[PDB]
Amino acid sequence: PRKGPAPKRPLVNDPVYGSQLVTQLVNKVLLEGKKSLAERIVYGALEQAREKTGTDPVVTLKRALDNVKPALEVRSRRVGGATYQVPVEVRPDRSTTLALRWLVNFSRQRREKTMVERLANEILDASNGLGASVKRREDTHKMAEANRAFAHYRW
Amino acid sequence: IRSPHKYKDSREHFEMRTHKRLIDILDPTPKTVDALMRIDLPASVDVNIQ
Amino acid sequence: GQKINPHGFRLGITTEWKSRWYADKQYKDYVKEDVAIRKLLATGLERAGIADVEIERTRDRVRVDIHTARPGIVIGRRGTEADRIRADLEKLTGKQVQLNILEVKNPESQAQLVAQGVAEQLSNRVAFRRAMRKAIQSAMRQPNVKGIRVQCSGRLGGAEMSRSEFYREGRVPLHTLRADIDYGLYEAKTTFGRIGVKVWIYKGDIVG
Amino acid sequence: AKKALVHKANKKPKFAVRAYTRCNKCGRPHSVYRKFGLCRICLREMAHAGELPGVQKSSW
RNA sequence: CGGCCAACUACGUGCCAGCAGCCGCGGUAAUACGUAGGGUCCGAGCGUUGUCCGGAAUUACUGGGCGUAAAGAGCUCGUA
RNA sequence: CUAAAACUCAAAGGAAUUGACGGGGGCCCGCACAAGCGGCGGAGCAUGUGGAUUAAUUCGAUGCAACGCGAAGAACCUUACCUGGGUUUGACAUGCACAGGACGCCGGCAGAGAUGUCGGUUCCCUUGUGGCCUGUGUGCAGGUGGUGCAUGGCUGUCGUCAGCUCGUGUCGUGAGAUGUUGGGUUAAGUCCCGCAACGAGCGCAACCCUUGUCUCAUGUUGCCAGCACGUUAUGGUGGGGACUCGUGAGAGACUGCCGGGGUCAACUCGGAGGAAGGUGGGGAUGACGUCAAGUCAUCAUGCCCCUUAUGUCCAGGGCUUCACACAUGCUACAAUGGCCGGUACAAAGGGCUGCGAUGCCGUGAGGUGGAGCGAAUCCUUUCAAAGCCGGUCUCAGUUCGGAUCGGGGUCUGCAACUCGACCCCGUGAAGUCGGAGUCGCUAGUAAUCGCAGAUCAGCAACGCUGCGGUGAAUACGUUCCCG
Incomplete structure (x- = not known):
């Protein structure tokens, strides 16, 4: 990364739903090196959302993403022994990555004992704004317009 | 291990390769059997008969 | 420790082997005989510089090529010291050897x-x-x-x-x-x- | 190892298990390959010298 | 009989005994210490010491210098 | 303010040159930070080290660059350490005599063993004596005894970082400089532009190995479509190089072409074709030098010390001791899971006093017995696990986890108590995802799952060296930390 920007990997389209969002989600939720379990988990969550909310999984997933997609983030930079939390706008790719990361991260702190309905429940909550990752999203926005005091450095 | 008495992270790999072929002769004309054992070969080559 | 042996670096590209033969069951015995005879040759004669010592061994037949600077010291007109080397190997029991000694141009x-x-x-x-x-x-x-x-x-x-x-x-x-x-x-x-x-x-x- | 230890290794043990390798050229009991009878140091030296018919630098 | 400065090998001693005009030689291979061979310079003389001039353009009249090597007074006024 | 002498040294100074150094700067790189994924420090266990004990707990290693390191294998041996019993030209060699035809083998008794005593067996020359050794020495052999701040050889580190020089010319009185400085680019002193420099060597790159495509040759133990013979036991068999594969030879990647930036330049961005596009992926290869870096325990070696001993044989014991600390790993703390049953796909390697199969007997380590192989055939089962399917468990110190502990066994070894591994039953401790801090990694990579090998009779291997299966996130950018 010292010489120049790194190349970007291609994204394989999904054969079942035809959107890169589900394959990005299954990549993000992948753990320990087992794909098959990962797509079966995410497809089970999609089907439970299908049977629960009564609407299509793609539209509600995109709506949840919009409800979780942030616009500003916080970057720590040090000078003279003091670290300042400058607010910086976010590229769309980082916004989507952060949204998926937050969803999957708050997918694992539940008590309801299996992954598929955990994911389905948080998808429904994020669609309705009742989730936990959304709370962190408005928290990040709150510090975005809260920490405006350090912006003249422009780093 | 390259070094005597320590430096385990430095090492050297060696190989030993042996190449083998077969020649099967049909219809053993007796002159062939007479002249076969007389053939002298390089020391690096070993041949056995079955 | 920086440089590897240049002779060993090109053992399969430029340079050749020093001893050539084939063995499976008696490989250890052959190599121990090689080291014994090489030690004997290195220790015995030193007034005449030995360029190389190569060994060939097939069945009972053995032959040792001794490349030296000048063979006159290693082989007199009466051949006392050449037969001395022969007998020294005989006590070591390398069986018969077609002992060859060559000078360098x-x-x-x-x-x-x-x-x-x-x-x-x-x-x-x-x-x-x-x-x-x-x-x-x-x-x-x-x-x-x-x-x-x-x-x-x-x-x-x-x-x-x-x-x-x-x-x-x-x-x-x-x-x-x-x-x-x-x-x-x-x-x-x-x-x-x-x-x-x-x-x-x-x-x-x-x-x- | 010592000369006495080398000879006692060459000596016939009275029990089957009292035998070990004891590399011929030097007498170093550790890291002896039974294929060659040479310890790792002498194996390396002779492999580089080209005195072992078949061994060579491995690269792949 | 190191180089200045014509003339080198062996034995004995090894930082000891000793040499030396300047720089310096002796702790096992000393052309440098002591003795033997050989050599060189002089020669009824050969060396050392003391004194003076030279080399010293190193008190510079012939014939030197003063930014940083030693050397411009802290600055002016003015008497011979 | 004016202003000496005795004494003492063989120099004190000025400018500039080449290195080294700076708790002096400026640029450029690197998983250095940042952006991410997974860990260590919390628990139990395996090793290694520090410290403490005793008879020894043999020795070396000691920021990076020691701490799963010498050691790719400590019950005796190993073993170099402690106790005790022998031995002296000795456990191992060579030379002389004084003396020789015996040393050398198989048993008996004593003894923990080493070792001591009896019983049977005794030399090939050819008389000069030698091939052999039996006592006394004579020369001595023996030191894992010391000095890696006297050494050779080998190795680590900066670091695969990009530097180290020369010939001719020119510039300086001269040491010397220039080239090698400046701008750009690159993985790079790789190359381009300008400039008193013009060129060339060792380093970079290429030559070597492996993986990715095609062509030719090629058929055994390998492949087996089209053919026949076999039918549940399978290329199994006669048979074909058609397809693989095995192993020899060759072609193919060169910024080769197009478009844009470019100094009509290096190079950079995108495209066309192609299996691969920008040194395609990865190895071996480690320049000049720094660290009195490590190793007299691989070996060799100058000097120093013992030599009836610090040499040498043997029996037992220790390196596995533990009130603690540190480091590297394994198992976990569970539902992305545990147990039960079914279900198919890898590679490489090893095998002679070894792989060892079918059957038999156990519940299981395993006992019987031996087919086929010195090995593309026979064994590692037609070779695995994760996978996929079906059942259950419905969240607890648990149907997790296995430590610790009692009992009964299997194998190897003369001998498993101190101190091997494995099997069966039973109890089932800590451990609820871990403070300050801190580590690894940029694509078949991280994350994992299994298999083989070396050392080895047996293993303490959760280590090391390799192979294969499934396979991600992120890199805006050099402000800060490190080299």
Whole structure:
């Protein structure tokens, strides 16, 4: 990364739903090196959302993403022994990555004992704004317009 | 291990390769059997008969 | 420890093996016999520099090729010492050997012999720099050589301090696999201890 | 190892298990390959010297 | 009989005994210490010491210098 | 303010040159930070080290660059350490006599063993004596005894970082400089532009190995479509190089072409074709030098010390001791899971006093017995696990986890108590995802799952060296930390 920007990997389209969002989600939720379990988990969550909310999984997933997609983030930079939390706008790719990361991260702190309905429940909550990752999203926005005091450095 | 008495992270790999072929002769004309054992070969080559 | 042996670097590209035979069950016995006879040859004769010692062994037949500088010391007109080597091997029981001894046409262009000469001249309490001067001049006299590097390490001059000194001339491209680089190592015994002499001789490239 | 230890290794043990390798060229009991009878140091030295018919630098 | 400065090998001693005009030689291979051979310069003389001139353009009249090597007074006024 | 002498040294100084150094700067790189994934420090266990004990707990290693390191294998041996009993030209060699035809083998008794005593067996020359050794020495052999701040050889580190020089010319009175400085680019002193420099060597790159495509040759133990013979036991068999594969030879990647930036330049961005596009992926290869870096325990070696001993044989014991600390790993703390049943796909390697199969007997380590192989055949089962399917468990110190502990066994070894591994039953401790801090990694990579090998009779291997299966996130950018 010292010489120049790194190349970007291609994204394989999904054969079942035809959107890169589900394959990005299954990549993000992948753990320990087992794909098959990962797509079966995410497809089970999609089907439970299908049977629960009564609407299509793609539209509600995109709506949840919009409800979780942030616009500003916080970057720590040090000078003279003091670290300042400058607010910086976010590229769309980082916004989507952060949204998926937050969803999957708050997918694992539940008590309801299996992954598929955990994911389905948080998808429904994020669609309705009742989730936990959304709370962190408005928290990040709150510090975005809260920490405006350090912006003249422009780093 | 390259070094005597320590430096385990430095090492050297060696190989030993042996190449083998077969020649099967049909219809053993007796002159062939007479002249076969007389053939002298390089020391690096070993041949056995079955 | 930086450089690997140049002879061992090109053991399958430029240079060839030293001993050739085939064995599976008696491989260990064969190699132990090789080391025993090589130790005997190295220990026994030293007044005549031995360029190389190659061994060939098939069935009961054995033959030893001893490449030396001058064979007159190693083979007299009456052949006492050649038969002495034969009998010394016979006590070692290497069975029968077709003992062959060969002289070298260019003793000045052989790294091992040059190293032996430098070591003996250092044993004569001669200044090392003069010995390297004369060795480099004599080696570069021959036309086909293209480079030479000569290095000695030890207690040079009798001082109580380690010293390693190297003198070079021409091209000695060690990093090339297709370069016929002759490598010679030898040891000089002095009053203060040990001296190590290394010689690299570069004589053109080879193309297959 | 010592000369006496080398000879006692060469000597016939009175029990089957009292035998070990004891590399021929030097006498170093550790890291001895039974294929060659040479310890790792002497194996390396002779492999570089080209005195073992078949061994060579491995690269792949 | 190191180099200045014509003339080198062996034995004995090894930082001891000793040499030396300047720089310096002796701790096992000393052309430098002592003795033997050989050599060189002089020669009824040969060396050392003391004194003076030279080399010293190193008190510079012939024939030197003062930014940083030693050397411009802290600055002016003014008497011979 | 004016202003000496005795004494003492063989120099004190000025300018500039080449290195080294700075708790002096400026640029450029690197998983250095940042952006991410997974860990260590918390628990139990395996090793290694520090410290403490005793008879020894043999020795070496000691920031990076020691701490799963010498050691790729400590019950005796190993073993170099402690106790005790022998032995002296000795456990191992060579030379002389004084003396020789015996040493050398198989048993008996004593003895923990080493070792001591009896019983049977005794030399090939050819008389000069030698091949052999039996006592006394004579020369001595023996030191894992010391000095890696006297050494050779080998190795680590900066670091695969990009540097180290020369010939001719020119510039300086001269050491010397220039080239090698400046701008750009590159993985790079790789190359381009300008400039008193013009060129060339060792380093970079290429030559070597492996993987990715095609062509030719090629058929055994390998492949087996089209053919026949075999039918549940399978290329199994006669048979074909058609397809693989095995192993020899060759072609193919060169910024080769197009478009844009470019100094009509290096190079950079995108495209066309192609299996691969920008040194396609990865190895071996480690320049000049720094660290009095490590190793007299691989070996060799100058000097120093013992030599009836610090040499040498044997029996037992220790390196596995533990009130603690540190480091590297394994198992976990569970539902992305545990147990039960079914279900198919890898590679490489090894095998003679070894792989060892079918059957038989156990519940299981395993006992019987031996087919086929010195090995593309026979064994590692037609070779695995994760996978996929079906059942259950419905969240607890648990159907987790296995430590610790009692009992009964299997194997190897003369001998498993101190101190091997494995099997069966039973109890089932800590451990609820871990403070300050801190580590690894940029694509078949991280994350994992299994298999083989070396050392080895047996293993303490959760280590090391390799192979294969499934396979991600992120890099805006050099402000800060490190080299």
